[PDB]
Structure prediction request, 1644 residues.
Amino acid sequence: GVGISTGTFNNQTEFKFLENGWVYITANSSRLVHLNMPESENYRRVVVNNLDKTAVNGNMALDDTHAEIVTPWSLVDANAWGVWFNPGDWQLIVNTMSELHLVSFEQEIFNVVLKTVSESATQPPTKVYNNDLTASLMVALDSNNTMPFTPAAMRSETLGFYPWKPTIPTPWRYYFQWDRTLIPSHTGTSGTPTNIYHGTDPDDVQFYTIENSVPVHLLRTGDEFATGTFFFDCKPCRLTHTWQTNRALGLPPFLNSLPQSEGGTNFGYIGVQQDKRRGVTQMGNTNYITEATIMRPAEVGYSAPYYSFEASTQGPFKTPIAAGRGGAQTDENQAADGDPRYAFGRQHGQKTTTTGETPERFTYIAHQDTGRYPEGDWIQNINFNLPVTDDNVLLPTDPIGGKTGINYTNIFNTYGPLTALNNVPPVYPNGQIWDKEFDTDLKPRLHVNAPFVCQNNCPGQLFVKVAPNLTNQYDPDASANMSRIVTYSDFWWKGKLVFKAKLRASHTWNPIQQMSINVDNQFNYVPSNIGGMKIVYEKSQLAPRKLY
Amino acid sequence: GVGISTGTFNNQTEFKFLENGWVYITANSSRLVHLNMPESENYRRVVVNNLDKTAVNGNMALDDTHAEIVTPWSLVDANAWGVWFNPGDWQLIVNTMSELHLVSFEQEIFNVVLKTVSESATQPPTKVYNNDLTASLMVALDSNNTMPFTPAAMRSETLGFYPWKPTIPTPWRYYFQWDRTLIPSHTGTSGTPTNIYHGTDPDDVQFYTIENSVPVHLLRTGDEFATGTFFFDCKPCRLTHTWQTNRALGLPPFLNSLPQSEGGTNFGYIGVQQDKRRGVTQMGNTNYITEATIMRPAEVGYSAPYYSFEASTQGPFKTPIAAGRGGAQTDENQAADGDPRYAFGRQHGQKTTTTGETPERFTYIAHQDTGRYPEGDWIQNINFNLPVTDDNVLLPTDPIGGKTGINYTNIFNTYGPLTALNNVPPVYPNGQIWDKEFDTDLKPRLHVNAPFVCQNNCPGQLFVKVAPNLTNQYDPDASANMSRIVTYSDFWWKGKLVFKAKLRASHTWNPIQQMSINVDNQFNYVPSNIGGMKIVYEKSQLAPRKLY
Amino acid sequence: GVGISTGTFNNQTEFKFLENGWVYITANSSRLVHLNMPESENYRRVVVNNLDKTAVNGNMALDDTHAEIVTPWSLVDANAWGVWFNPGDWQLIVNTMSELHLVSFEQEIFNVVLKTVSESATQPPTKVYNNDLTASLMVALDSNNTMPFTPAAMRSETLGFYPWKPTIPTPWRYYFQWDRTLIPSHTGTSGTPTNIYHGTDPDDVQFYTIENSVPVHLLRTGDEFATGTFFFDCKPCRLTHTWQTNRALGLPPFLNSLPQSEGGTNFGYIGVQQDKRRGVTQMGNTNYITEATIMRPAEVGYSAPYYSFEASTQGPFKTPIAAGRGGAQTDENQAADGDPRYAFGRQHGQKTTTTGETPERFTYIAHQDTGRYPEGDWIQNINFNLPVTDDNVLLPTDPIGGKTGINYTNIFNTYGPLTALNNVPPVYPNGQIWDKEFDTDLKPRLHVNAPFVCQNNCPGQLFVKVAPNLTNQYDPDASANMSRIVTYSDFWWKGKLVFKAKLRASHTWNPIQQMSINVDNQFNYVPSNIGGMKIVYEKSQLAPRKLY
Prediction:
């Protein structure tokens, strides 16, 4: 009731060691959640069209045009690593574990409190906060997944990552179908390229409402709500990275001459003339057997067009790629297409005492060597007469379509039946944990935003909303917006995310990479003298594994 | 208690598919209901007499004279289609179902909240809202149907049609017997026609009070009330329309000459001289057998006097008719007597963001072809000498009583033992669902306001009222009206209306009419950019069925 | 508790038809009851002495001198017909029933609410009402009848007669013994007649307190109280009236000459000389046998001194009489001694919208013909020489004691062993229902105020009082009256009064008197256009019955 708590705070992470090197990881997360009443009680169909930006020739990548339904509901999303693990737990997992299985998820709301605000007309303004013991919090669990799936991690709008910091839900909204055409252009393009919002296709209209699709629980201060346990059906997530490219697959050539002294220039030598060597190649018209030409079982990674923008009914979108760029591990400045860039605020890692709306950002450079170095690619004539002449080779420095800044690698695609690739690594703390699989007939082989993909279903989205607190003058048949008592709710959210992981084994003489605190990064993991906190991103696939 | 909810919000519509093509439709509807304390705590016997309007000769149709008992109670009425089905559900029903059975109805009130208003005498006015945890809401269910039946759909005063929009009950009142005489007149009528309110007949006086007839429950904030399930006993409602008139019944004539080429003017021909044909007619003194004169099994539809006003003890009233006008399906402007016209506000379909008290209106044009085209009627002498001469035929253009604007069709009635007709179609969203059968010895064959008629009884009306919240200065022996604390209540209403329907079958080569979203009507079914909503009317008897 | 109701409102009257023409009448009555805290918390012994009025010679009938204990308690009295039956129920009972048995009575208090008033010192006065959730209502049921019996109907201070109108209890007080002498006088009396309040006789002192005699329940807002069912032990009450006087008892004389034609003056004739007739008389010295002198079995009714005032220890009081005056049925203006006169306010029948403290009044004229017509009495000498001479007869026009306005009928008493009389009829709505029998050794044969007399005991009186709500400055050892928080209570009272009645039978060819609505009285039974209500008195012994 009014004076009785309905739940307990718990933010402990439990590691229970099972038999045969398996560990049962239970991540308990609890948060105080602050919820204001919605700006409006009505659903809105809102169109955004930043014509001012895209009207500048060459700015088509800046398109924000879309249509969305703005709802009075708020989304409680815990689908991000930082919600469940602090840096120490993450270190333990990524240093001691080799693979991760997502097992189950459950959440509850308890200790609901609803308050009203009265602001007097006194010349020196003043306001008072009073409990509304009979007011209700509306809670809806879309366990059947009737609503569109809108994971908040993509917008950095999940629950906060600090147990001792109150957090907020995010106002819920979803895309509403629209037709939009945007012809690309460049600086110096003559005229005005077609840039039009065409409207909505009636056959694609889907207006969803929570009230018509999901049972809604009314929670007074003495009530609680528990979702029950949901069990996942996902593939395991590897906590190791592969390093072998095509060049490091299989038996190396036999070295007939080995170095006799230590030193930088004391190389070995194969010792057999290149066109007199033994082995197998797929180049049926040459006798050269080299590390570049020797047959490999398949292809590790693939080349794809990079910063290619494809257009469909709704306008242009960047073509996604599975893996990051090669060479970024050596030079951070070379991080580009395929290296996810995260931008987030003070709830999710940015130093909490900073000021301004400029977000904290980082580009994740995965340890896996499955990318491409397009500056090193080339195409040459089938005749394969070496050394190749200018007319018989296409180089990455050769312009395509007359454009000095575009080469064939920009439009190149080597994905095929022989392609082998890995799933995206977890991105702590801002990365998404699980994602919903598409309801297309043919499904993608992976998702680029989360390591765990929901093959059949994963937990229903949790929606909350302050129930309307009407004054005595309400008139439903009037055009003016409803008159409401200013009401807001604080409730406690507790979730339990269960993983299963395998303890790693030492396979090599040498030690392996391990996440460690050091003098440089020390102060990223403790509060500042004024309580300021931050959570820096951490890599997750530290240890290597042999691909082949 | 104070901090514990007593019910759950549910506005889902469930379709459970039974065996053999039958579907169990459960319509769950939930609403937040706002109730102010009554203007007065006393019953009033009020007489209305718009003598100013009817005193103008020729305005007798504008009579509003009547007597009613105004009660302090409010009526919670959910008897309208829009309360239970959104447009998508209605589309599913009317496109996939052939008939509809009304099964059961139940409703409950929960999460009662009562608040008081205190408005200070401060020069800048201010008011505060406080919970009255010990105040009560008075709830009475007239399960025995002791009270007069006053369905709110007729006045467009049912609960609103939007789950996310708070709604209100309607102040309850009922007719009180009166005698009234109004002699009709026209412009140019000499003198003042008798226009008098005669009073009340003592033998017809019926003063009903809720307190003396119905048990009254007092609900505090921790209490709830459930009516229990009521099971209906009504006839099924068809979701198909008949198109066959008398002219399309039975075996057509045999065509002895069929067209040889496609084209507009390539007609067939019966090929037998009209007075030499074989068949049966009811015209015993003629040898002509034509499509107009051939015997048909019975009569589909009937002609009735239209815009005829009959007078009784209480004054004039329009004579109702079962079916709409013929030709309205081709031309909307020809919709007249028999085509119900609905007028409603922003709770019940009118664009919620509109301003002013002008209501939204529509005339329902049913798909069934059971009406009459009076311009096509005629009467001719029994001698039946063709071509008929002027003196031997009465045409719709012949004046009656010397009035150029009145013809015999205005006073014509062809209802008889051979008449066949259909029940009124459901009118979504504003149409009434069920209605109470009259307690006369001889009962009408149908009602024009609802498809489902209550043969024995249907659910008792639900009445609510804020219990009087007295100040300390109450004096019952004083003439002044009672001094009350300004109190109002918000409670949640939930109802469950159960139907049973039969899935339609395809009987013909061709497809049939189906309700569909399209480019024209698209934006009638989604919110506006400022949250404005509307519910446009939908037809219900789309698919055809053969009458004979 | 605070948010949970403890009872249900019910004002229904149930007629359950038993076997053999008996009906079980259950009168349910419910009221909202408003109770202010007592003016003082102490008992007071107060003496009233309107010496100014009685000091005028000839005004002794206006004596109001008495002594009473004024208590801080309030009395909840439902002992009046109007509390239990509306006019329709009363019509049903008095038209269809022949006798009435009082069976049982029970009552309860529920949904208690206590509030405090805070009135600010702001220059524009303002006051606020707040629930005192911990305050208590003190409720005492004197089931043992230890307290004096003070039926409120005598002062028109019972609960109100309208279910939808809040009512109040009456401040409780009871008589305290006193000695008082008032010598009667007339206009023109010389000197000052003795008019003295003598004080109190110590041997007759009885100071009663609720606290010392009755267990007291403390009800907080979440508590209720039920008296339990009390079963009465009273005689049945007839709903028929007798019409036969002594003149209509037994065998009429045989008419030897019957009229031969219809007409006003066609009388029958006994046809036997009066002193030659056969029969029996109690006049042993006369041969005249007439309708006036023939022996009758006994005497119906009796003559008593009228407007006689007897004096005892406490001063003069009117001598009560069992039956009303003869001839009042023909002329209302002749209603006098024995015809009870009721005066009441707007809670109990007076038009609720009237203004001023002038009460509504009516004189009840019973249908029974058991009274006397003193103008028709006479006394004559035993010699009985007819026609009687002046000296041998005492006429009602003969002065007694030399007073032209006083005759022997004013001091006449014919009550004796032969007297037969009826119980007083019920007086709807203001009449008392039951009354407590005196605790004298010899008990009266009836009471004039109620038809049902309590032979052993009838339900204990119900007392309520707002418990003292003290401020922080209370000092019990100070002479000043206690400082209390202004507190008041609203509670719901529900009672159930059970009767048993016998359905009437038709004994005669002719129909009988029946209460009916008509054009004249129509508007006495329905609310006015501003909600004004009234309850007019109704007669109860409509149907006749044969006495002998």
